[PDB]
Design a protein around this nucleic acid. Structure first.
Ligand SMILES: [K+]
Ligand SMILES: [K+]
Ligand SMILES: [Mg+2]
Ligand SMILES: [Mg+2]
Ligand SMILES: [Mg+2]
Lengths: 48, 367, 56, 123
RNA sequence: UGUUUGCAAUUUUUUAUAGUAUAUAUCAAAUCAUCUUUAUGCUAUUCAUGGGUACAGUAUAAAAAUUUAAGAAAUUAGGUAAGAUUUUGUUUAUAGAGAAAUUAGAUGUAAAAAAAAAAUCUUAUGAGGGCGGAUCCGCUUCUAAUAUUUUUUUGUAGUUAUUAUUAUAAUAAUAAUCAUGUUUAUUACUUAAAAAGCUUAAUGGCUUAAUCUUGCCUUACUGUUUGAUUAACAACAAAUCUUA
């Protein structure tokens, strides 16, 4: 209940995602990850 | 007001200001601080004359007088001679123009003062990186048991200065490099330049061998010479070329090759025979710097590094010079498990033959 | 990457300190006063001048 | 509160962003500062070597007298070196009244006082 | 016209010229937000809101500024780079201050410089040593390097000063000596064990980093794959480490 599992959706609209955990009483996650569909580092943002 | 006078600021400041030496600027503190150093340099020069005349007295003195013989007389003149050198450097290390002349590159390197500051500049950064390249790239103990560089060596390929330990292309490293060597010691000595490739792969014996890519000797060098072109070693400058420059190459598959550019000093009055140097490399396919140095009594003084691996231009460079070995690729040796094959174990693994065809719904197509 | 801290120092003046004996010396201080006339000091304290009878 | 703001305004000026920036000298000025720097350090050497030379000479004089004093005898029927052994005693040297406060407290001053010296002092 | 106003001072690159690969200049970037009105106002004086005058290195009237401490707070833990290296406890002292509050402390040494002779091994991709079967293997002499000897010694100055003799100098002895460097010096080695710290108990480990601080980061990546855990758990599976 204290920790939630979020989904970091790629901003290349390729449908790839990364799942990381973070506390509810925190800000949304945002990272620069490697999208294997386009094979390039793009911006991944939390789903909601 | 042309480019021969300096920079735009100088050419500009040299036409709007007055003509007056920098030492004669009428500033209180600057002229009061130049008066302290003034009478100091007069006191140091007055000490060089007192220590100079003190050596003659010790020079024209029977060794029998000294309770220690001739051995105690050379150790007393040794400390005196060294004490004079420090006084010659301390007589101009505070001069404001000597610092300006050395920084502008117009300083005479035949004087101890300029060589003292030139050496204090090299050690500040350039020595540190080359001392690191020797250890990290395992030049020592691979090539030499121990090596502390004493002179600066900067090599440039076709004008562009290459940093120490940089993987260069097979086309860039196709012509003899130019060595920008600065020597901080007095006198003129003969310098021997040896470029050795220490990573030549020998597949027959499963090890690496050393191949010399360039060898020259009997190169007179003074602390006033800066540039040395390895192309004209026997045409313009005096020297004996044992082996001309060989284009570095590295076959596909093998790791990067290290090419070590070594500068070795010959002892005073020791000129390597032009025919005995070209005989050493005869029937020698594993050039050993250790043995070579011990035979000619040389001493390593300077060193620089640059690597070379397989690149697009490697194949074509071999064609021009006929270097054989282009159609040879190296693959990493694979070590398979040493465990003998064993029968599979488990309930499912046993019941995997046609005998248990009725139980194949539990044994086949398992995720 | 170690940071190189810069010194944070206030403005300083050169002050003349005239003790109770009339003697004057120069000091470096932050106060804006020019001359500090000291009526009471070690030169007018019995603990520092036990043999003086005028202060006794 | 108003007085406190006056205090904060003093610290706000000392903030790393408000204080002046690092100096920016040209070559001629920089070279001139180098000579001023070089001379000052040498000047300290001369003061240091001079101050250390006097300190050395004084110590040698004490050692000479002490070494000589150790070999002497007397006065009268006193064993050799009695005076040397008595001089090395440190009775009260590290006590509270070792050094008179008056002598130490008096210091050097740029200008003298109304009465530079008191000759009327009586025991 | 970014970069300090008196003049080729950092690195690399661009361009140009001379030049035959070098040399100088130039350009860009990195390092850094230094503040920029050449006077138009002020000041003094003088002369009728005003008009002059001032002559500037002892610079000047001629610009002292012209249109609410985060380096006082947050215990943020991973990749990488650099810097720091006993931080715990105990003990000593220290206004308020006490059994119990903060701060400062708490090992020692070195820094002019050695040369030379043989011996004992050990190593060497040293002499492509020699002999048996250039590199492999077994024998092996020679040189070189490290280590070791208490071994064989020789030298132990110079500089500053003192003392002694000698005719300010010379000689001998004695003491000091890291210092051309902003003394808060600096640099290297050394400073028992336990303890502190490292997400959490205990055990082991780390102080030469796995701790701490800071800069930039998010590889806490995708696919497949190697060798192991003396063939993980004395089977299988879920697992742990590791390679390309
Ligand atoms: K970090
Ligand atoms: K300890
Ligand atoms: Mg950690
Ligand atoms: Mg403590
Ligand atoms: Mg098993």
């Amino acid at each position: 209940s204290r920790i939630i599992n979020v989904r970091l959706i790629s901003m290349a609209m390729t449908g790839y995602f990364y799942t990381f955990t973070r506390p509810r009483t925190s800000l949304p996650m945002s990272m620069l990850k490697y999208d294997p569909i386009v094979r390039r580092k793009v911006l991944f943002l939390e789903q909601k | 007001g042309g480019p021969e006078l300096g920079s735009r600021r100088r050419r500009a400041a040299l036409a709007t200001t007055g003509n007056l030496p920098f030492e004669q600027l009428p500033y209180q503190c600057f002229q009061d601080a130049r008066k302290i150093l003034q009478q100091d340099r007069a006191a140091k020069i007055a000490q060089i004359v007192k220590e100079t005349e003190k050596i003659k007295l010790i020079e024209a003195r029977d060794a029998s007088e000294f309770e220690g013989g001739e051995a105690a007389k050379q150790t007393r003149i040794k400390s005196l001679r060294k004490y004079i050198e420090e006084l010659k450097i301390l007589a101009d290390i505070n001069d404001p123009e000597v610092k300006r002349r050395f920084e502008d590159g117009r300083g005479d390197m035949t004087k101890p003062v300029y060589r003292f500051m030139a050496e204090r500049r090299w050690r500040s950064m350039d020595y540190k990186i080359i001392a690191q390249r020797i250890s990290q790239f395992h030049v020592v103990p691979d090539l030499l048991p121990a090596f502390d560089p004493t002179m600066d060596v900067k090599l440039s390929f076709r004008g562009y200065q290459v940093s120490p330990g940089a993987i260069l292309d097979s086309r860039v490293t196709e012509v003899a490099p130019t060595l920008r060597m600065q020597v901080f010691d007095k006198g003129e000595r003969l310098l021997t330049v040896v470029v050795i490739d220490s990573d030549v792969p020998d597949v027959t014996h499963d090890n690496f061998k050393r191949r010399c890519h360039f060898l020259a000797a009997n190169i007179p060098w003074d602390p006033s010479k800066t540039v040395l072109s390895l192309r004209s070693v026997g045409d313009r400058v005096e020297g004996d070329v044992g082996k001309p420059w060989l284009p570095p190459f590295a076959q596909k598959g093998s790791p990067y090759h290290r090419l070590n550019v070594f500068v070795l000093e010959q002892k005073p009055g020791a000129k390597i025979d032009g025919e005995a140097l070209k005989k050493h490399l005869e029937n020698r396919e594993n050039f050993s710097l250790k043995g070579f140095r011990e035979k000619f009594d040389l001493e390593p003084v300077g060193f620089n590094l640059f690597r070379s691996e397989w690149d697009e231009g490697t194949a074509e460079v071999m064609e021009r010079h006929g270097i054989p070995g282009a159609e040879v690729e190296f693959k990493r040796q694979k070590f398979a498990s040493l465990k003998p094959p064993r029968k599979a174990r488990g309930w499912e693994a046993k019941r995997q033959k046609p005998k248990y065809k009725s139980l194949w719904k539990y044994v086949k197509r398992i995720a | 990457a170690t940071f190189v801290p810069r010194h944070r120092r206030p403005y300083q003046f050169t002050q003349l300190v005239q003790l109770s004996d009339g003697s004057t010396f120069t000091v470096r201080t932050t106060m804006p006063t020019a001359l500090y006339k000291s009526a009471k000091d070690s030169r007018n304290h019995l603990l520092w001048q036990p043999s003086d009878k005028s202060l006794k | 509160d108003p007085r406190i703001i006056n205090i904060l305004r003093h610290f706000a000026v000392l903030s790393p962003k408000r204080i002046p920036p690092p100096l920016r000298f040209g070559r001629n000025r920089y070279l001139r500062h180098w000579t001023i720097h070089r001379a000052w350090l040498l000047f300290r050497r001369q003061q240091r070597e001079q101050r250390e030379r006097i300190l050395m000479q004084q110590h040698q004089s004490m050692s000479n007298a002490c070494e000589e004093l150790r070999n002497t005898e007397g006065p009268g029927t006193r064993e050799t070196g009695y005076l040397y052994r008595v001089a090395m005693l440190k009775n009260g040297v590290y006590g509270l009244k070792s050094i008179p406060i008056e002598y130490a407290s008096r210091a050097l001053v740029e200008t003298p006082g109304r009465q530079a010296w008191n000759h009327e002092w009586k025991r």
